[PDB]
């Protein structure tokens, strides 16, 4: 292995300060997100991490013409930062972030402004860091972009990003010091992952002739599974495959001919909305398959946590089921099962239930709720791989009216993560009338223990309404969102904005496999809904 | 004939809508107050002869087989009616939004929605049965029905006219002064095309009945009526849709001895608020169209949603307009190429000639707050041509106050004075912004001036935002100038309907200025840059 790669792969796994600095306001708080204790960094890495990315946009905090100085405090603040993170013996990856869009997009026709924004940004960078360590690495542009002309892309934005690419190369490197060996990362352009981009990366990387350089890509899922659109709701082989094909592309490109990669960010695009949007069985078993994937291509990942994922305020994660299937996606396959849930009427009477699991190499152990294993043969039984709730102990374990998750039925193996079954008591879930503007139009719900997956929408006619027309299945939380809490389905503007004077069939896929219909009067500003 | 004089002593008409109409469980789920006895008296007293009273039921209906009516929701549209008759006005009943709510599937609910039909309007009979005859039934508001294929159909036609004549013969049916009640029946939507008025034509001349009337609605050439692709100005395209409009209407029933009652009529963009058509405009609008209605024997009911006249005062929310249009009732009124004569600040004061619209009417002096002001020396008309002198304007104005500095009250020999307000305005000046999508705003300094419309390009000139089929905004629904906060907010709705790019505004003002911005979309937020 070279000595470039064992420093890619050393940073495995990243993690990314999303929202802060790179937030395009007047302080790394416009966001929402604090600021940056010395705490955070201190969990960062007690965590399992072992290098973090610092997103920073800098256009609201630099000067004007031809100093572009960087105000002094928001680079001694994130300098801070850096320091912290390396006083934890983690990599730092510096970059500019929003600035892609926000200038740089605009090098068509501005030309030499942003490449004078562009050059004098990297020559303070570069000058502020010269004397630190190694593992402090630049980017050059995150995910970046430039103007369409005719549509993306063609031509002009490969030369763009090359030139930018080239000069921020040659300014880091001729700042000399510790950028001299300085690791540099640079982007695909968009930061994507098709044959084209890699192979224009590749090229500027041969022609820049370094040993210290360190392709960069993006990914954040199938588009349509990522944000719930069309129906795919559950994670199958089309996901699967895309990442397939994505890392095999990226490994074949980058990896086999000795240049390491940093996919410096994933995620799912439907965080960007609420991680509510993919169900929590679907996410877990789309973590591990990608992370897997990832280990076997020698592909260093970084998470992208805006904030959603780690509470900053208590430094716990939020979702820890989520980072426990991570930390353990780090060292192997975890098994999944074709489901987290085990859905029980509350009517029928109970009986054997079976589950198929994905043992992903493993072998079962044994299952425990509350802490305390439960009783081979009386409690459950195992056939190859599909495993099978035995009638009594589920009686034992629910409690008949109680509609929702009853218990946890928690599924142990020789090796990775523990899989965590909710026992949900459901009935059918039904509807009510309701009327309203589009402005506000909230459906009551008893939902009955249940989980809705996706909603349809079509006219009387058979049309598909509302947004993205080429499809039935309505995007989660952009049209329309489950609350639980205050038992209601919210639809919302941006839905009534693309539908006609009409009556709206919806059709709700529910995670226990119900279906229930409901019926909108639009015209105009208000609608009536009817069961 | 005495149909014909009936529907013309109507004139004019208004509408109590948002009221007994609204869809909710009574007359103010819409934001009306509930409606008072002074309320009409008001409406009778300042001029009107026939009101209009929308009604939605669905929602104080019965179950199967009665569908009976809620006493007190019905003994309060009995109340009002019988008010509005206490002040010898003429009433109009029909079924209101009940005509999306459940009347559209009728292709898919028949027995259904003729069973409340008919129960519907026997109620409605059987209560009004001893009421004078100068109430009217309207059978249903701009029917329409489920779209199998797109409007129009086959099917909608034959459904329309089955409606129509349930209701005539239970209405027929049940006799006492119902045996001569005259009956409004309406063209499908309500719309004004060749083909739907002869099917209406043919519908009456089926029903061989001297006591029908022919009803039909109206808000205006839809592009200006909502102030959509450029459309700014009240030209000739918003007057011939018009004319031709209404000469289809007066060609196919009025005479052929059948009147036509406008029961409807207005722009449809007020119903996101009156400030999406400039003031003048919508003036010349209003009084070129009731200019032919009148010259058609069309009688007008003005559609008033609470938004017209203050139901709270008893007074109208924009004098003007109301004078505006009941001068109209009597003749036409001349209008202007402006409402407004704009003056920079700070350039030297010029003579500045301003083009009138003699509508037939003649000019007799100008008002400045009641007072009438020297001839030749303060203005001069050649023609038509009227022309502010220097001093004139010089003393009227104030240097550096931007905004309505005075009002010129141009008084002709017939016809409603035409106010004009003189503007002093500069340049109007942007600043930069960054925000969400969900609450974007532009800091605004207008200076006295007024938005007409915006554009908006990606630069590479493809038409950006809703309606992508032209450059021109839709007012209000995509942006909206708040004066009162100095502010130029973009919506919700436009930013759903745009790429993540760079997007080129043009703000057009009513000054002839235009100010250039650009925001750079990136998900969820927006960059804002003068």
């Given at each position: 292995?070279?000595?470039?790669?064992?420093?890619?792969?050393?940073?495995?796994?990243?993690?990314?300060?999303?929202?802060?600095?790179?937030?395009?306001?007047?302080?790394?708080?416009?966001?929402?997100?604090?600021?940056?204790?010395?705490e955070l960094i201190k969990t960062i890495a007690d965590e399992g991490y072992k290098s973090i990315r610092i997103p920073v946009t800098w256009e609201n905090q630099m000067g004007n013409a031809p100093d572009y100085t960087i105000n002094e405090d928001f680079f001694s603040r994130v300098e801070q930062?850096?320091?912290?993170?390396?006083?934890?013996?983690?990599?730092?990856?510096?970059?500019?972030?929003?600035?892609?869009?926000?200038?740089?997009?605009?090098?068509?026709?501005?030309?030499?402004?942003?490449?004078?924004?562009?050059?004098?940004?990297?020559?303070?960078?570069?000058?502020?860091?010269?004397?630190?360590?190694?593992?402090?690495?630049?980017?050059?542009?995150?995910?970046?972009?430039?103007?369409?002309?005719?549509?993306?892309?063609?031509?002009?934005?490969?030369?763009?990003?090359?030139?930018?690419?080239?000069?921020?190369?040659?300014?880091?490197?001729?700042?000399?010091?510790?950028?001299?060996?300085?690791?540099?990362?640079?982007?695909?352009?968009?930061?994507?992952?098709?044959?084209?981009?890699?192979?224009?990366?590749?090229?500027?990387?041969?022609?820049?002739?370094?040993?210290?350089?360190?392709?960069?890509?993006?990914?954040?899922?199938?588009?349509?599974?990522?944000?719930?659109?069309?129906?795919?709701?559950?994670?199958?082989?089309?996901?699967?495959?895309?990442?397939?094909?994505?890392?095999?592309?990226?490994?074949?490109?980058?990896?086999?001919?000795?240049?390491?990669?940093?996919?410096?960010?994933?995620?799912?695009?439907?965080?960007?909305?609420?991680?509510?949007?993919?169900?929590?069985?679907?996410?877990?078993?789309?973590?591990?398959?990608?992370?897997?994937?990832?280990?076997?291509?020698?592909?260093?990942?970084?998470?992208?946590?805006?904030?959603?994922?780690?509470?900053?305020?208590?430094?716990?994660?939020?979702?820890?089921?989520?980072?426990?299937?991570?930390?353990?996606?780090?060292?192997?396959?975890?098994?999944?099962?074709?489901?987290?849930?085990?859905?029980?009427?509350?009517?029928?009477?109970?009986?054997?239930?079976?589950?198929?699991?994905?043992?992903?190499?493993?072998?079962?152990?044994?299952?425990?709720?509350?802490?305390?294993?439960?009783?081979?043969?009386?409690?459950?039984?195992?056939?190859?791989?599909?495993?099978?709730?035995?009638?009594?102990?589920?009686?034992?374990?629910?409690?008949?009216?109680?509609?929702?998750?009853?218990?946890?039925?928690?599924?142990?193996?020789?090796?990775?993560?523990?899989?965590?079954?909710?026992?949900?008591?459901?009935?059918?879930?039904?509807?009510?009338?309701?009327?309203?503007?589009?402005?506000?139009?909230?459906?009551?719900?008893?939902?009955?223990?249940?989980?809705?997956?996706?909603?349809?929408?079509?006219?009387?006619?058979?049309?598909?309404?509302?947004?993205?027309?080429?499809?039935?299945?309505?995007?989660?939380?952009?049209?329309?969102?489950?609350?639980?809490?205050?038992?209601?389905?919210?639809?919302?503007?941006?839905?009534?904005?693309?539908?006609?004077?009409?009556?709206?069939?919806?059709?709700?896929?529910?995670?226990?496999?119900?279906?229930?219909?409901?019926?909108?009067?639009?015209?105009?500003?208000?609608?009536?809904?009817?069961?």
């Amino acid at each position: 292995q070279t000595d470039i790669q064992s420093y890619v792969a050393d940073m495995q796994p990243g993690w990314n300060l999303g929202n802060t600095f790179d937030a395009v306001g007047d302080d790394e708080t416009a966001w929402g997100n604090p600021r940056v204790t010395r705490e955070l960094i201190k969990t960062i890495a007690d965590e399992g991490y072992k290098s973090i990315r610092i997103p920073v946009t800098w256009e609201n905090q630099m000067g004007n013409a031809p100093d572009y100085t960087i105000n002094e405090d928001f680079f001694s603040r994130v300098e801070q930062v850096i320091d912290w993170a390396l006083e934890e013996d983690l990599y730092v990856m510096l970059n500019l972030h929003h600035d892609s869009w926000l200038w740089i997009y605009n090098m068509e026709h501005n030309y030499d402004e942003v490449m004078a924004k562009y050059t004098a940004l990297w020559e303070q960078l570069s000058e502020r860091f010269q004397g630190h360590s190694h593992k402090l690495m630049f980017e050059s542009v995150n995910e970046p972009r430039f103007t369409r002309d005719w549509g993306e892309i063609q031509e002009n934005h490969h030369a763009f990003l090359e030139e930018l690419n080239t000069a921020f190369y040659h300014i880091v490197r001729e700042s000399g010091g510790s950028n001299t060996e300085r690791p540099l990362v640079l982007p695909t352009l968009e930061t994507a992952t098709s044959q084209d981009l890699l192979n224009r990366l590749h090229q500027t990387m041969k022609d820049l002739n370094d040993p210290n350089l360190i392709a960069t890509v993006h990914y954040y899922g199938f588009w349509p599974f990522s944000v719930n659109v069309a129906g795919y709701t559950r994670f199958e082989e089309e996901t699967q495959q895309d990442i397939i094909d994505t890392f095999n592309r990226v490994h074949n490109t980058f990896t086999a001919n000795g240049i390491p990669v940093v996919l410096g960010e994933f995620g799912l695009l439907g965080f960007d909305t609420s991680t509510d949007v993919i169900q929590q069985g679907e996410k877990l078993k789309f973590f591990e398959f990608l992370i897997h994937h990832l280990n076997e291509r020698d592909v260093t990942h970084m998470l992208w946590d805006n904030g959603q994922h780690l509470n900053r305020e208590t430094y716990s994660w939020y979702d820890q089921e989520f980072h426990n299937m991570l930390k353990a996606s780090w060292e192997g396959r975890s098994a999944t099962a074709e489901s987290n849930l085990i859905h029980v009427r509350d009517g029928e009477p109970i009986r054997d239930q079976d589950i198929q699991l994905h043992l992903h190499g493993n072998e079962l152990t044994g299952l425990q709720v509350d802490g305390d294993s439960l009783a081979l043969g009386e409690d459950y039984e195992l056939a190859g791989d599909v495993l099978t709730m035995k009638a009594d102990a589920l009686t034992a374990l629910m409690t008949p009216g109680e509609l929702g998750t009853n218990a946890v039925i928690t599924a142990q193996f020789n090796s990775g993560a523990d899989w965590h079954f909710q026992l949900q008591n459901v009935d059918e879930p039904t509807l009510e009338n309701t009327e309203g503007s589009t402005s506000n139009f909230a459906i009551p719900a008893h939902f009955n223990g249940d989980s809705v997956a996706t909603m349809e929408a079509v006219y009387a006619n058979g049309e598909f309404a509302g947004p993205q027309n080429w499809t039935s299945f309505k995007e989660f939380g952009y049209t329309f969102s489950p609350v639980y809490d205050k038992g209601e389905i919210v639809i919302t503007d941006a839905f009534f904005n693309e539908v006609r004077d009409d009556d709206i069939h919806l059709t709700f896929h529910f995670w226990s496999g119900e279906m229930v219909e409901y019926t909108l009067s639009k015209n105009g500003n208000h609608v009536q809904g009817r069961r």
